[PDB]
Design a protein around this nucleic acid. Structure first.
Ligand SMILES: [Mg+2]
Ligand SMILES: [Mg+2]
Ligand SMILES: [Mg+2]
Ligand SMILES: [Mg+2]
Ligand SMILES: [Mg+2]
Ligand SMILES: [Mg+2]
Ligand SMILES: [Mg+2]
Ligand SMILES: [Mg+2]
Ligand SMILES: [Mg+2]
Ligand SMILES: [Mg+2]
Ligand SMILES: [Mg+2]
Ligand SMILES: [Zn+2]
Lengths: 43, 120, 96, 162, 25, 222, 55, 38
RNA sequence: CCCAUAGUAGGCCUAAAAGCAGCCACCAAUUAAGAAAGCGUUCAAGCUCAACACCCACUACCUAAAAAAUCCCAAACAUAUA
RNA sequence: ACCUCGAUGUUGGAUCAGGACAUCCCGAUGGUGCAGCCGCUAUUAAAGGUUCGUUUGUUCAACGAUUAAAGUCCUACGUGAU
């Protein structure tokens, strides 16, 4: 019933994509790895 | 106007909390690093691709050792969002001339000088 | 206690209360007598009256009421509260 | 406890007020420093809606409940018991806690439809005919919003909308 | 292409939304 | 019995002349013969001027960007003049007269032929800028009431705050921003460039710290 | 520390205990000795193996 | 009844009730204050 | 959850506005009530609230939902251990 | 001007109907500046009708006679391999 306008990824009215838990855990672990890299690159 | 994003000097400053959290020490720092490309060069600017290609990190999950100088420090800070920085420690001494064909990199950056295939 | 005034108090004949001042379980009958002797519930009818009997050696808070149908209702408020006896009297005077 | 007794004898209704006996709390509380009856027994976020013994100690035999000044619960604990007791009378629990009525239980209309985790009233919700597209789908609620801080053992949050 | 300031809220990028969702209070 | 606290006496606040709001005209005294573009950077980001109080103790705090034309000013001044006490309350305008020109072409015209003609004039309003300021010898309930009555009518989000209320809201905001559990702040990731996020972000986000987006303001971003 | 037996107080899985480590090692020694005896006495036939050849 | 999103009491005898999934404002003194939640 | 007497029709164009048409001061009696804090009033009556008397739960996380044309769309599980 | 100039037939009317309410009605409610038949407001329900005619080239538009009505939109501004 609900119709999406032209292209659900580009344009104005688009289909919004949200975040779950796997993406959050991946971002957390990547930020931890990058903080470890920052710490090891501080000397 | 997306260009080259610079990083201030206040971010790369050691703190006692970070020393107690990890396994580092300010006095007598390490001399070699262990870089590991974990993110692709695609969807990244051209200068990042050039830095990755010049640092010798073509294939992914490939170890490589550089120096510990401000030049390589900046080269690693440029692509920190693409690779992984890990120090290199030596449990024993440096591999001599006779201990060349018998060596191993091991995990967690432990260049062992005597690697065997027998259990303890 | 406006429900007793909105309902009515005409068919009642004579009511009275009996309790002791020095007892610690006579506040219910006291506030019952206070609510039953207000302004609206007293001016809604002039053919009735109340009797305030206060004794010392009574040792019982009994309240006996009766209306014009020749019946009789006595309720001793030894353990009952005020709202309970109020709604009981209201139901008894509305049903008959 | 206290009950009312009315007797008829010679057109003289005798309304009495006899006070009966009632049990008390055990003389050995695990946490005497607690301020609530649930917190003094270490039952903080440790009970569910299936506990028919815990819910039967704060309600009335005719289906009613008890206020906070009588029991001793706070503000957030009294609402949890008020929600869990509504999920029991609908799932067939507590058969002896039915409301009194003259003679209305004569025409058995809808049969005993078994149900559990009932959050809202049956004969009141509207049937979902459109259900939305896909992303903004209208799911059916279940459980209770106040029973989310309980202890879990499935390594996943309590999914209340599915 | 839209401007930087509009009235229809304008949903942000996927990476920006992920960053705002992972860095909440 | 209950205690009886002394009422707050009002003896240091004197009402000046003309307690009602002044009249706001449409076009200024001199028309602008040079058509200016619609610069959208005048409402994006936090406000610089007209932030703190000056004379009164009550003002409407804006929580978003937008434009206000002659009709909005007329509605606001009429509501203030019809819902106040001239012997106990007085308000002073905080925003200047509208001067930003807006060019509009004819209805049903092809794309081209240069810009249109200047019709009305608006004024830029950023987030956190006090729209109107009102003082007097009254309390806090009635003024907050008839100020939120007008703030709900405004296009952008706005609330009726005072001095103590603004102090308390800033205190709880800084308390929430200094006591964060997760050690991943938006500022730390935006400034240090983590995970290559600077490709999809904006250079203005370094000063906004993820608290602004176009014209709105999210006070729960921290 | 005492908690009444409700619906969420006790875990759903049964509480599993561990035996004595000395008795467990003794039982393991007895089992491997019996296996060695059965191997040296010849009471097997048709055996299989998982050889990791050529990966 | 009148469809109203923001319900409020228009006088004194108006009492708020929660029935059939909607908040209704019943009143016996002034029947003109009957509101319905949409 | 209960509860409300009086110095008065406090001062004035309109016939009078007697507590809600405008002005500076908005008095004053017993415990305690405003020359008026919210409806019905040409000029009067009808109802509550603040204040005694009386007990004294939270006396309020502030506001943030919507309906077009072939027919709505996969199904399901809040409770055996990341 | 995003498939459509190696071809998407264009206004009505006859016939055929489908779906939707932002409902004219018969089904069911509450109020009224509802005294009773004449009206209005807000809700649920589509199982039907939506006339007989003139002239101007009409989907537009004009006038005579009824009941509860001569309702609206989409279906290639419905339907020319009828
Ligand atoms: Mg499409
Ligand atoms: Mg009076
Ligand atoms: Mg084209
Ligand atoms: Mg063509
Ligand atoms: Mg062809
Ligand atoms: Mg063809
Ligand atoms: Mg309808
Ligand atoms: Mg014809
Ligand atoms: Mg056509
Ligand atoms: Mg055809
Ligand atoms: Mg033909
Ligand atoms: Zn009313």
């Amino acid at each position: 019933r609900g119709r999406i306008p032209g292209r659900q990824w580009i344009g104005k009215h688009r289909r919004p994509r949200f975040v779950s838990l796997r993406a959050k855990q991946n971002m957390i672990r990547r930020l931890e790895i990058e903080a470890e890299n920052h710490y090891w690159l501080s000397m | 106007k997306f260009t080259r994003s610079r990083i201030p000097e206040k971010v790369f400053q050691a703190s006692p909390e970070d020393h107690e959290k990890y396994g580092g020490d300010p006095q007598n720092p390490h001399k070699l690093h262990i870089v590991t490309r974990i993110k692709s060069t695609r969807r990244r600017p051209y200068w990042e691709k050039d830095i990755i290609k010049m640092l010798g990190l073509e294939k992914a999950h490939t170890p490589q050792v550089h120096k510990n100088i401000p030049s390589v420090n900046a080269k690693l800070k440029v692509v920190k969002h693409l690779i992984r920085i890990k120090p290199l420690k030596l449990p024993q001494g440096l591999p001599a001339e006779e201990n060349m064909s018998n060596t191993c990199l091991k995990s967690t950056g432990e260049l062992v000088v005597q690697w065997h295939l027998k259990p303890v | 206690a406006a429900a007793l005034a909105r309902l009515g108090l005409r068919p009642v004949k004579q009511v009275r209360v009996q309790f002791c001042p020095f007892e610690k379980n006579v506040e219910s009958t006291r506030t019952f007598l206070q609510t039953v002797s207000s302004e609206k519930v007293r001016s809604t009818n002039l053919n009735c009256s109340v009797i305030a009997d206060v004794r010392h050696d009574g040792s019982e808070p009994c309240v006996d009421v009766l209306f014009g149908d020749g019946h009789r209702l006595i309720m001793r408020g030894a353990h009952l509260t005020a709202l309970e006896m109020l709604t009981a009297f209201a139901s008894h005077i509305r049903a008959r | 406890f206290r009950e009312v007794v009315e007797t008829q004898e010679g057109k003289t209704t005798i309304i009495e007020g006899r006070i009966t006996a009632t049990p008390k709390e055990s003389p050995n509380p695990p946490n005497p420093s607690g301020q609530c009856p649930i917190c003094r027994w270490n039952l903080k976020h440790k009970y569910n809606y299936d506990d028919v013994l815990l819910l039967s100690q704060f309600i009335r035999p005719h289906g009613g409940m008890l206020p906070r000044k009588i029991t001793g619960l706070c503000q957030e604990e009294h609402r949890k018991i008020e929600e869990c007791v509504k999920m029991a009378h609908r799932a067939g629990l507590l058969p002896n806690h039915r409301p009194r009525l003259p003679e209305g239980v004569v025409p058995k209309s809808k049969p005993q439809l078994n149900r559990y985790l009932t959050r809202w009233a049956p004969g009141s919700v509207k049937p979902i005919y459109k259900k939305g597209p896909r992303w903004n789908r209208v799911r059916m609620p279940v459980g209770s919003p106040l029973l989310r801080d309980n202890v879990c053992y499935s390594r996943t949050p309590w999914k209340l909308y599915h | 292409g839209s401007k930087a300031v509009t009235r229809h809220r304008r949903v942000m990028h996927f990476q920006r939304q992920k960053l705002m969702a992972v860095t909440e209070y | 019995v209950k205690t009886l606290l002394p009422v707050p006496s009002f003896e240091d606040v004197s009402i000046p002349e003309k307690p009602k709001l002044r009249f706001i005209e449409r076009a200024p005294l001199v028309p602008k013969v040079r058509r200016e573009p619609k610069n959208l950077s005048d409402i994006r980001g936090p406000s610089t001027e007209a932030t703190e109080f000056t004379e009164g103790n009550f003002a409407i705090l804006a929580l978003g960007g937008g434009y206000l034309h002659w009709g909005h000013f007329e509605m606001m001044r009429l509501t203030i003049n019809r819902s106040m006490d001239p012997k106990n309350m007085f308000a002073i305008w905080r925003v200047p007269a509208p001067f930003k020109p807006i060019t509009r072409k004819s209805v049903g015209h092809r794309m081209g032929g240069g810009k249109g003609a200047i019709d009305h004039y608006v004024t830029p309003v950023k987030a956190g800028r006090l729209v109107v300021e009102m003082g007097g010898r009254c309390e806090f309930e009635e003024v907050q009431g008839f100020l939120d009555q007008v703030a709900h009518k405004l296009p952008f989000a706005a609330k009726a705050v005072s001095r103590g209320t603004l102090e308390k809201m800033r205190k709880d905001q800084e308390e929430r921003e200094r006591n964060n559990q997760n050690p991943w702040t938006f500022e730390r990731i935006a400034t240090a460039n983590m995970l290559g996020i600077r490709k999809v972000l904006s250079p203005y986000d370094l000063t906004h710290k993820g608290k602004y987006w176009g014209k709105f303001y999210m006070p729960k971003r921290v | 520390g005492y908690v009444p037996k409700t619906s969420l107080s006790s875990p759903p899985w049964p509480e599993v205990v561990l035996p004595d480590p000395v008795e467990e090692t003794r039982h393991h020694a007895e089992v491997v000795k019996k296996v060695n005896e059965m191997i040296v006495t010849g009471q097997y036939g048709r055996l299989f193996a998982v050889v990791h050849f050529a990966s | 009844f009148k469809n109203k999103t923001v319900l409020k009491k228009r006088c004194k005898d108006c009492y708020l009730v929660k029935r059939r999934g909607r908040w209704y404002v019943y009143c016996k003194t002034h029947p003109r204050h009957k509101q319905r939640q949409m």
